[PDB]
Design a protein around this ligand. Sequence first.
Ligand code: CUZ
Ligand code: CUA
Ligand code: CUA
Ligand SMILES: [Ca+2]
Ligand SMILES: [Ca+2]
Ligand SMILES: [Cl-]
Ligand SMILES: [Cl-]
Ligand SMILES: [K+]
Ligand code: NA
Ligand code: NA
Ligand SMILES: [Zn+2]
Ligand SMILES: [Zn+2]
Lengths: 586, 588
Amino acid sequence: VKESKQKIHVGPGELDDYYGFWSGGHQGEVRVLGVPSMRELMRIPVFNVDSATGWGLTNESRHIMGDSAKFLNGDCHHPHISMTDGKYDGKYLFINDKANSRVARIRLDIMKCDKMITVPNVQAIHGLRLQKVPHTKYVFANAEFIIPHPNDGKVFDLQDENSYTMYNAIDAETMEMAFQVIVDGNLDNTDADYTGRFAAATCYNSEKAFDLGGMMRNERDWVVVFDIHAVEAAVKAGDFITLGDSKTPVLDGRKKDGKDSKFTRYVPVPKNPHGCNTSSDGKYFIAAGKLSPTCSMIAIDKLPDLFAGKLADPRDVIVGEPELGLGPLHTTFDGRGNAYTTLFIDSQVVKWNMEEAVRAYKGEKVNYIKQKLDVHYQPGHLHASLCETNEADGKWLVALSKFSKDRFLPVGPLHPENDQLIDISGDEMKLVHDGPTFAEPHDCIMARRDQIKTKKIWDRNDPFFAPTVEMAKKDGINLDTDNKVIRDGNKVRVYMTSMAPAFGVQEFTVKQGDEVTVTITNIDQIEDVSEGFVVVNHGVSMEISPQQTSSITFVADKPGLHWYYCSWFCHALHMEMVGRMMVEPA
Amino acid sequence: QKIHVGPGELDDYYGFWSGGHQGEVRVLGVPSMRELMRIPVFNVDSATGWGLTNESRHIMGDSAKFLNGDCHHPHISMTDGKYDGKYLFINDKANSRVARIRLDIMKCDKMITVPNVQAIHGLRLQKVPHTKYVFANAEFIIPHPNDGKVFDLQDENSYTMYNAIDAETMEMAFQVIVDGNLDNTDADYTGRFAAATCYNSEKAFDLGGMMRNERDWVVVFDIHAVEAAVKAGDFITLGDSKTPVLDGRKKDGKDSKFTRYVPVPKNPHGCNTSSDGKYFIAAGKLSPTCSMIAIDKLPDLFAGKLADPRDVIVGEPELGLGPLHTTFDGRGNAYTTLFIDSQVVKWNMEEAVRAYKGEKVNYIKQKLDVHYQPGHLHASLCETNEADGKWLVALSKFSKDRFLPVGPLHPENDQLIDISGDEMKLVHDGPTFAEPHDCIMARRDQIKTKKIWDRNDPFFAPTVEMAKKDGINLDTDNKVIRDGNKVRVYMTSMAPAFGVQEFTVKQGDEVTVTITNIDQIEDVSEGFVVVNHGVSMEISPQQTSSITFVADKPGLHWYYCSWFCHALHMEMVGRMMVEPAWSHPQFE
Ligand code: CUZ
Ligand code: CUA
Ligand code: CUA
Ligand SMILES: [Ca+2]
Ligand SMILES: [Ca+2]
Ligand SMILES: [Cl-]
Ligand SMILES: [Cl-]
Ligand SMILES: [K+]
Ligand code: NA
Ligand code: NA
Ligand SMILES: [Zn+2]
Ligand SMILES: [Zn+2]
């Protein structure tokens, strides 16, 4: 006997116990929440353009974004935190972009996106998860959509021998591609084991069909299992091809005339399986059945025998297939031996015992279902605290439901997502809070307060603006002290320190048509004194926090006097923290 | 008064938060302080496609080229001094705009770039007899014309202007040249008078100069005189704008017909009309006071019956260090933020007036510590004659240690305070992003929203008229219209299928995709994303939305529905096939 009775109220002056990192959904950012209050503490821009901080306008952010800075949109789903020895290490958060086929890395000490990659030769990065052991060496990313190779407009047939999609491994630390594995069918979600050897992905379109009926044709799709060690061996030996103009090593993980690749095994699993979730004890890849009212449990410790050819049938690694309810989509873990699965149709979370399910699969009459909790309504992902680690603590569960209906005040034709906080600390799940959220966050991840360590003020050597420091060095500028205007043809490079309540350069004059770069270094040492910079009627806006250098470039296409001002309330004299750009005509 | 909204309970109020430097408007439930919706305005929203779609770019006009805004001041339209729930208006200081949000669909439906001005900051609405005008301050003095021949703020043609916009048409109604500059503004409860604070009577550009004068002022506008002069045709126009411009400057110590200047210390900031209609209350900021302007002494002021403009001041209570903003409980108490002392001070307005006449009396009732450095504050219904004295939100600029560390950039702290009693009680710390400066609350029953669009809605009526030139019935048609190097795809959609699931174009073609969501059920929002083309938008029930992009890449390119709509959402996809340029006629 043990009751679910955790406190959910965080009053004024008290602090949350966990960080929550929510996907921004179709809006493209990442959001930091406090748990259990469920309040949003910060927004981290990634694929969106943020007016407030200038992400997508500043030179530092556009440098990180590369050519994809031309896109103003992203579509996020799956946020994950880097691990060492199967425990969160607080270093990085990674997230997908389904719309423009990217992966982004967030540095959790500064809470900013610091690296971004467009995955080559694929369309739509959706499923995403991290290697656990011995650390997050790879980020594993699913490209969802089958395309021709090359995709040059000669062939559109998705059944062509060179039409396929690929599993993607990105080097977590350099954020360069590591390798890609061609697969049969398509990819939905993915997860990794607790050794570094195996990873797995559900596939819903084993039919390689383009119509909805054609995609639900097979009684069984599969989860494809990857022998990452075998892939690495082939890469070290130079046994790969490359595609197009990408140097990324490409391995062929498809079945050929019924013959298995060395890199993959295809395990039959019903049906359009969706979630692919690794239990915190490291025993199982659990695939949610979706169109089948089941989950399929793959025994990770049978995978070595599978790849060695010691098992008679790939179905032999399946050790449980519990029947749970209608529309199972995703699974999470309390660390006590239970799994928690969302039932999209029944609109519930079902708590079930994994080892009891395994015994039932063998024929024992044992009820593995512990409880079903109604949620409101149509849940997709769910997430228990530390569930992706061997420290899963069984304290909090968030279920992310797609249809909020009447759970909040009406706000027009568009509705919020309902992210419901559930106490799982005791024997009985208890619903404690309804959290409305914008643009369908879809999935989220939690970390203990003591697993995250952030900077109070920037380091002057920070790589985030190192390229700007280098520019300054070429101009002979000391960013910590200088207030100078550099003239170079029709290019003007203004450098200034800023400290509330005065810009270090309070006026400058240019010629109509000049290309103006303004570089600002906030030389305050006081935490929380953020500064801003806005050029009126020129589309220019950015943040400069303490000890940060930020820069932005725009053309002075309008003659006359044009004001700039500090946007971040920084001082009692904030309204008066302003300057003048004077633009001479021809 | 219940503080917590449990699962299945609803909030009692809507809150409309300024999005600050991030540029949107946010809808919260009060008292839970949870965000229920985001309404894109000056930001580009990946999720709904605002700033990408043809409908939204049509509304933004030429300013669709800007990806930023800087919001401060949301206000709800009124009839006879009470909110009527029709419209929300908000400022853009960064690119000099005013936007209107329709509160039935919770979208921005109109936007205007205010001509011949820089930086729209202060904004407020006429109260009586209804919101005929939106009043908006341009903060910064500029040359006229601003053609780069003259830069001097002291020149006789350097000035800023007060701006009145027609609330219903969202066209300019008039502009009034002022001395000094303009910070915040409010309006009376008759329709005759509006008022604005000024902090730069010195017309300087450096920090020292802007603080030189012991007093600046609040400028008072006689709107009846302005309208009369417009009907009489006694006005000029500036540049290409047809907006009537009236001159409200002093000339050689003689007042204009349109304005009076009441000296107020010092770099005053907030300008707030008491809910009983009695006072314009100016927050003294660099002066540890507020200045109370007796609205019923204004007619005499404008008729020469008073010797000194200061004679309309009937109170000037000493409150504390750095007064910025004032609000009202409807019980005769005012509440003022003290930025430096980091408090909310509750004070009785009638007793402050008594003390100004020398009657020794302590008008200060309570000082509540807030965390930290508060800017604006808002009490529920404070802008109307129904000010109900229930909730107060103070919007503080430095949250410091009140929330978990999230790196060098901190959230703002918007603190909900219970004022239903004699003692202010702090009940909730609400962190927010990008500095909402201000917010406005409305009772649940003051807001009525639509769940399904009407097919004739003006938001996409331009799109309906485009479709008709192509012979298209948007409610039924799934057609690919070709027109040179332009391709216009029209489709219905209803979960989980697009009505056009594939189409073929030539490389370089300009493709417009128009989708009409013909579902009838509430909350089946659909989406549309073209992979690797920077294309994303929302289509809600009965809405038509459209988006235009160049098919610049040969090959097969998937599109998919982004908004979860169905159990078969994952499979609601389509294919754009782009034939390569080398297989079609070659152009340079
Ligand atoms: Cu722009 S100021 Cu006190 Cu309104 Cu926040
Ligand atoms: Cu510097 Cu506000
Ligand atoms: Cu239609 Cu998702
Ligand atoms: Ca299938
Ligand atoms: Ca002054
Ligand atoms: Cl998953
Ligand atoms: Cl104000
Ligand atoms: K702040
Ligand atoms: Na990169
Ligand atoms: Na307009
Ligand atoms: Zn997902
Ligand atoms: Zn899912």
